């Protein structure tokens, strides 16, 4: 149902850039990097 309007990623998360020109999401909670967010 449409997109919410609160926060893209929870705490311990850092949207950053990897590969060459794509924004990833540096997961600090479990040390990892995902292009999409766990909560949309």
């Amino acid at each position: 149902f449409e997109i919410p309007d609160d926060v893209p990623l929870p705490a311990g998360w850092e949207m950053a850039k990897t590969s060459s020109g794509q924004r990833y999401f540096l997961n600090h909670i479990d040390q990892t990097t995902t292009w999409q967010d766990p909560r949309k």
Partner: peptide, 5 residues
């Protein structure tokens, strides 16, 4: 692919 932390 993807940056391995």
């Amino acid at each position: 692919p993807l940056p391995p932390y």
